[PDB]
Amino acid sequence: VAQISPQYPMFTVPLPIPPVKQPRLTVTNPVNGQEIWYYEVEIKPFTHQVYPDLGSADLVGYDGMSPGPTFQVPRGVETVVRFINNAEAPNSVHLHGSFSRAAFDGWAEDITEPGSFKDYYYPNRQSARTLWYHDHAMHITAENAYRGQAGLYMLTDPAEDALNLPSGYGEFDIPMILTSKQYTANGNLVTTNGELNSFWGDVIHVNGQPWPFKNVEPRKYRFRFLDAAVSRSFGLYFADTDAIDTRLPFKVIASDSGLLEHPADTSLLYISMAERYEVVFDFSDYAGKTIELRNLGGSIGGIGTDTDYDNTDKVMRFVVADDTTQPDTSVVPANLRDVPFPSPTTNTPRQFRFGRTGPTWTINGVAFADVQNRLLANVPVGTVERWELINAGNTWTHPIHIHLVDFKVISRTSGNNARTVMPYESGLKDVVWLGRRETVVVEAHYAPFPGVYMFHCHNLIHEDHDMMAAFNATVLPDYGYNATVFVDPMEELWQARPYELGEFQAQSGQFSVQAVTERIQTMAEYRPYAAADE
């Protein structure tokens, strides 16, 4: 249907690459003698001229940019990130794809008010994967993500580096953060505030830029796709501009949780909110061509309900040179890794229905605001469970996400007989798309940390109103590991703390080297991640 946002100069601005975030300090962990990387991120308002010939857009971002800066962290290095709110609304940071302790996971009520900060302690022990960090503040997650609070966090492993996949952040390893927004006639953002169904957006962005282009060489590139949109799901394909309907083959190498067992030969990639898929595209057969990255219409080929607009079939263009300046020394091995699947279980799947209760998006008829009723599952730590995720609706779709865990997709049924499990769903994931009338069974090891964790739809409008609940990964009282201080996301020890802006700007007082060092060493003594050792 007709674009609402102003006409945009399509494919004229280069694809921006978010800069890599550098830690301020390293602190010796007195428990293990290892260095903890300490980072400071300032959440603040800024403006950005998205439309060349109109006014600016008002944004609020990590370090006053959108997307947020990219973290690049090796497995085995613990990090602490001081997320400092210097904005106008509260925040809660979640590292999506990290088995963080409950009080470092971005529990929706575990907020930082403007003029406060929270220290988040991350383990960085899981399989190499594309994580992302984004806002999770109760009721305002959609608008906080939409106005710019999302960034990438790449967990690296030299074992993955030895596969010789296309490499170098911003060279042949390219972040592809997809959003879908709407703009006013003067080039400001249309707010998601007041939307209670879905905010589709009519302007497609990659790394914060509407409809960009990139100059590429005729060789293989790693693309790290993330759907960071509020409500738009995508069916991605690549096409020569000389045959814009003919899909070109590519390989999917990784899902949310890390590498597939084998690359999946693909010409169409379904990706819904919060899904990461890493793709290798080989431009070598397309020297001197223009390859358009496009998006399936028809509400993602009858799987979704998303509105299509005039230009939401277009994502970006790749202008391919006639030859490479350096040899392509990259490869996509037929065997990528042994995926660490959980044990199969014979236990009766739990059932969760994602539907509506009057006007509210609910799980089993419950809204996250309803403290009394929102704790829908108690699961002993170390248990494997199958969850049957049911979308009985034909007029909504729900990408479902479970915190803490990686899961295997066991089965999909479609009441429209549309599809089953996709080949790129063969590995481990943490989001799965319930298309129209879809039921998906996932199987997950509820390990290794006890605590209260969220699961929800990652359509942020649904999530905000109010399609989110909690599970408690439980332990017996003789279980050690300081569990009494790490099970409760609201534990006073880990709460946000007020700061003076001068202190921050001068790196004095509680931002002195002494104060940060004492704080992180005290945190480290509690040994939050010890139960994941080996």
Ligand SMILES: *[C@@H]1O[C@H](CO)[C@@H](O[C@@H]2O[C@H](CO)[C@@H](O[C@@H]3O[C@H](CO)[C@@H](O)[C@H](O[C@H]4O[C@H](CO)[C@@H](O)[C@H](O)[C@@H]4O)[C@@H]3O)[C@H](O)[C@H]2NC(C)=O)[C@H](O)[C@H]1NC(C)=O
């Ligand atoms: C999510 O799961 C966690 C467990 O993984 C759970 O935390 C547990 O809460 C229980 C119950 O509150 C705690 O056990 C209590 O400990 C205190 C202090 O030592 C005791 O006073 C309590 O004794 C009561 O129960 C006794 C019966 O055995 C009675 O004799 C007595 O009258 C008391 O009423 C009780 O044992 C336990 O320490 C925690 N466990 C951990 C590891 O923190 C948490 O509550 C769950 N979250 C939610 C929201 O459900």
Ligand SMILES: *[C@@H]1O[C@H](CO)[C@@H](O[C@@H]2O[C@H](CO)[C@@H](O)[C@H](O)[C@H]2NC(C)=O)[C@H](O)[C@H]1NC(C)=O
């Ligand atoms: C649980 O957390 C406590 C508190 O940080 C840890 O105890 C500290 O350990 C070091 C080394 O023995 C001492 O120097 C500190 O004084 C301790 N503080 C207190 C008051 O005990 C404890 O080691 C942690 N336990 C586990 C199992 O991780």
Ligand SMILES: [Cu+2]
């Ligand atoms: Cu998320």
Ligand SMILES: [Cu+2]
């Ligand atoms: Cu998450």
Ligand SMILES: [Cu+2]
């Ligand atoms: Cu939903």
Ligand SMILES: [Cu+2]
């Ligand atoms: Cu979440």
